[PDB]
Design a protein around this ligand. Structure first.
Ligand code: A1A4C
Ligand code: ZN
Ligand code: ZN
Length: 229
């Protein structure tokens, strides 16, 4: 059930959850799909990840306006790369409170990203320090450890079977682990499984560059990561 809205695709995953998809024509490799989430929490909307660009991100807000018609209370972005943080200005222009890993906001300038307004910090166990993620409601935010990037974070939705690995997790039939230029070879496998252990009740794993999968994605990604050991 893919709904086309301008150059973006929206798919309902569950009663209060949609997957937003945006495309960037990358030279030689084609038009790359990137996924985030839109979660209705009672009388407000929560956004996970921007589109690639400000224009695309503004089309997510246009879609929310038409299809939900409630204020976007906050957005959380899963690491400091264009597919996840490219549209930060569009969120700020819309007056939306924005949250990222402290380290994402630290990296954002040199990555050519605009920093989120607010910084998340994580306890030893990797769960977000609740003080830093206020009014997140059903969004459960977890730092699995260094993987796809050193600053990558994951999000589960309470009252839902859905967990989001971002660019850390690839689908169960994936060939490679993709871009590893900013990756941590050592702890990737561990981080991939820490995400799995953090959301064990999650039967639908949403990820950046594939349609939603089974938990096989996590094991498959972790198993492919174990070759980097
Ligand atoms: C940041 C980044 C991404 C997004 P992410 O998956 O790393 O989050 C990317 C995402 C996808 C991608 N092709 C998709 C199929 C296989 C590879 C390449 C990506 N390249 C490398 C390009 C930079 C300019 C020319 C090559 C990236 O630099
Ligand atoms: Zn990335
Ligand atoms: Zn990615």
């Amino acid at each position: 059930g893919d709904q086309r809205f301008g150059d973006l695709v929206f798919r309902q995953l569950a009663p209060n959850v949609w997957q937003h998809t945006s495309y960037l024509d990358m030279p030689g490799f084609g038009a790359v799909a990137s996924n985030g989430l839109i979660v209705r929490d009672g009388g407000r909307v929560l956004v996970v990840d921007t589109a690639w660009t400000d224009d695309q991100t503004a089309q997510i807000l246009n879609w929310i306006k038409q299809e939900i018609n409630l204020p976007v209370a906050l957005a959380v972005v899963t690491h400091a790369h264009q597919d996840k943080m490219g549209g930060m200005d569009a969120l700020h222009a819309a007056g939306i409170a924005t949250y990222a890993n402290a380290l994402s906001n630290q990296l954002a300038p040199q990555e050519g990203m605009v920093a989120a307004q607010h910084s998340l910090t994580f306890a030893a166990n990797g769960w977000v320090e609740p003080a830093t993620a206020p009014n997140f409601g059903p969004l459960k935010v977890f730092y699995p450890g260094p993987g796809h990037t050193s600053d990558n974070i994951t999000v589960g939705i309470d009252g839902t079977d859905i967990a989001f690995g971002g660019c850390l997790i690839k689908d169960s039939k994936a060939k490679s682990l993709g871009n590893l230029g900013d990756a941590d070879t050592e702890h990737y496998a561990a981080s991939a499984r820490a995400f799995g252990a953090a959301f064990p009740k999650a039967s639908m794993i949403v990820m950046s560059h594939s349609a939603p999968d089974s938990r096989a994605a996590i094991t498959h990604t972790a198993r492919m990561a174990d070759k980097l050991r």
